[PDB]
Design a protein around this ligand. Structure first.
Ligand SMILES: CO/N=C1/NC(=O)C(Cc2ccc3ncccc3c2)=[SH]1
Length: 327
């Protein structure tokens, strides 16, 4: 069957920790007071939660209240434990409180409010310097969570709140996040279609932090080439075909060979044969200002089929693409 794989960094971070750190099921929640928060307006709804803008009446500060639905069940404890483990980390959303919602009867997470500018309006209007600056800020969050033994598993533009006026960024929505344990097989039904790594698309379960680096690569490609999204699949199968039209089929078949993966036979009639395209094929008069040799070299090292071959978050922070960003 498939050959096993391990992360090449932060491999055994959880194994050395007391079970209290990663055994989220045994965690005991410290409940705050629901009366401290007044709901102001509904912001949105996910498949597992409802999100509201609210006011913390004990300091008149704006907050966000995420009311979890029952569908989460046992997974609610995992999100709370991850948020508490990561609290204070660079560019990680701050969990301010956990209260019991009176109406729902399920847990409500209270977060610091970020005055965000919508990604459809924003991440496609940034200058070359701002793409580099915000990417560097997202990498600080990813290196922190990976160093803490956690994979986000849902990196995408909707999950990055940016206050552009204040040049501040937060990585949010830790509801799919998981603790990395070497040798563990994980669910491949994570991340959003356009940001799913090839390991998810070929049903390889022993993935790691490097999944977040593929998703980050997809975001970078969309910003530098001004294409939303970069890999525009119609479903999870066509998603892999879209990737193969760019990266080629030979390196895809080499990846499947290396990990001894059984590729779903439905790919035999749709993948075709493709060669890797040079990154300059995606450059045009509208996006040429955002493209440099350093941006293309960086993107090339994130968008690799072999998850073990992608840059780690710390290696990405060392890349020349970021030499122009004030540190
Ligand atoms: C389906 O989105 N579920 C979420 N998960 C989070 O962690 C959120 C956190 C968050 C944190 C700060 C915000 N600030 C303003 C608007 C939305 C904000 C959202 S929303």
């Amino acid at each position: 069957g498939p050959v096993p794989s391990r992360a090449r960094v932060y491999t055994d971070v959880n194994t050395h920790r007391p079970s209290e750190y990663w055994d989220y099921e045994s965690h005991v929640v410290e409940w705050g007071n629901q009366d401290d928060y007044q709901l102001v307006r509904k912001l949105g709804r996910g498949k597992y939660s409802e999100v509201f803008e609210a006011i913390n009446i004990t300091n008149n500060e704006k907050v966000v209240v995420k009311i979890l639905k029952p569908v989460a069940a046992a997974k609610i404890k995992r999100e709370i434990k991850i948020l508490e483990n990561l609290r204070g980390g660079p560019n990680i959303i701050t969990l301010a409180d956990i209260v019991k919602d009176p109406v729902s009867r399920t847990p409500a997470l209270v977060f610091e409010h970020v005055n965000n500018t919508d990604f459809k309006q924003l991440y496609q209007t940034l200058t070359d310097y701002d793409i580099r600056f915000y990417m560097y800020e997202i990498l600080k969050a990813l290196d922190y969570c990976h160093s803490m033994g956690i994979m986000h598993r849902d990196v995408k533009p909707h999950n990055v709140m940016i206050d552009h006026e204040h040049r501040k960024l937060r990585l949010i929505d830790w509801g799919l996040a998981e603790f990395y344990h070497p040798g563990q097989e994980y669910n491949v039904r994570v991340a959003s279609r356009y940001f799913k790594g090839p390991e998810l698309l070929v049903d390889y379960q022993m993935y790691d932090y490097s999944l977040d680096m593929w998703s980050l690569g997809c975001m970078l490609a969309s910003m530098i080439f001004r294409k939303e999204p970069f890999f525009h699949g119609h479903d999870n199968y066509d998603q892999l075909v879209r990737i193969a039209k760019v990266l080629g089929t030979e390196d895809l078949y080499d990846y499947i060979d290396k990990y001894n993966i059984e590729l779903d036979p439905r790919f035999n009639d749709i993948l075709g044969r493709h060669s890797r395209k040079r990154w300059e094929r995606f450059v045009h008069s509208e996006n040429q200002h955002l493209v440099s040799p350093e941006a293309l070299d960086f993107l090339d090292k994130l968008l690799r089929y072999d998850h073990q071959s992608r840059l780690t978050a710390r290696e990405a922070m060392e890349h020349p693409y970021f030499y122009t960003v004030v540190k």
